[PDB]
Amino acid sequence: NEVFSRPEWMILTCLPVPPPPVRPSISFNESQRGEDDLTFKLADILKANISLETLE
Amino acid sequence: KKLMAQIFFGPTYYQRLRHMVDDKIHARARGPMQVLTRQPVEGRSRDGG
DNA sequence: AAGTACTTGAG
RNA sequence: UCGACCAGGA
DNA sequence: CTCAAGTACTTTTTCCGGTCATT
Ligand SMILES: Nc1ncnc2c1ncn2[C@@H]1O[C@H](COP(=O)(O)CP(=O)(O)OP(=O)(O)O)[C@@H](O)[C@H]1O
Numbered sequence: 001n002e003v004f005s006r007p008e009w010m011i012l013t014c015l016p017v018p019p020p021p022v023r024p025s026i027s028f029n030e031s032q033r034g035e036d037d038l039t040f041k042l043a044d045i046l047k048a049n050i051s052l053e054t055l056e
Numbered sequence: 057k058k059l060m061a062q063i064f065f066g067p068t069y070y071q072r073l074r075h076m077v078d079d080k081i082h083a084r085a086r087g088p089m090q091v092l093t094r095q096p097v098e099g100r101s102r103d104g105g
Numbered sequence: 106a107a108g109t110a111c112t113t114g115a116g
Numbered sequence: 117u118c119g120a121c122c123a124g125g126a
Numbered sequence: 127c128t129c130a131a132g133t134a135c136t137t138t139t140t141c142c143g144g145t146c147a148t149t
Binding site: 100101 | 142143
């Protein structure tokens with residue numbers, strides 16, 4: 001569909017970052033930070049990206 | 057008055073089991089909510105729905 | 106376990 | 117205050 | 127260039143304390 005789903009959009013260029021309500025931080029006091037699984041994976045994508053960009 | 061029927065009566069070894077009502081009985085009408093889903097929590101223990 | 110949905114392969 | 121295993125109920 | 131067989135995939139009833147590690 002010309003408007004809602006072009007074949008080109010099946011390939012990712014710009015990734016949407018879901019907000020905290022989706023990936024809540026599990027705080028187990030003050031000092032005990034604790035983040036979600038989805039937060040770790042995004043950080044890892046962002047880690048992987050920063051490397052690829054520096055190489056280029 | 058004498059019961060019309062005669063009852064089979066005598067001793068029988070009976071066991072007290074661990075399922076006592078006041079350890080089960082639960083009612084929740086609004087209370088603690090899950091962080092993520094924002095829905096009631098699970099179990100009488102957590103006072104869930 | 107039993108479909109499906111394909112590749113992989115013989116004649 | 118998070119979720120995995122185990123053991124149980126009808 | 128047809129069709130046999132090998133390849134992979136996706137399901138599996140409903141509600142209802144303790145112990146471990148780590149968040
Ligand atoms: N695994 C299970 N899943 C779902 N329902 C269950 C179940 N086990 C038991 N039940 C429920 O319990 C009902 C019958 O189980 P029970 O009550 O324990 C036997 P009973 O009626 O006490 O005596 P019976 O053995 O003479 O029939 C079922 O019809 C069902 O509704």
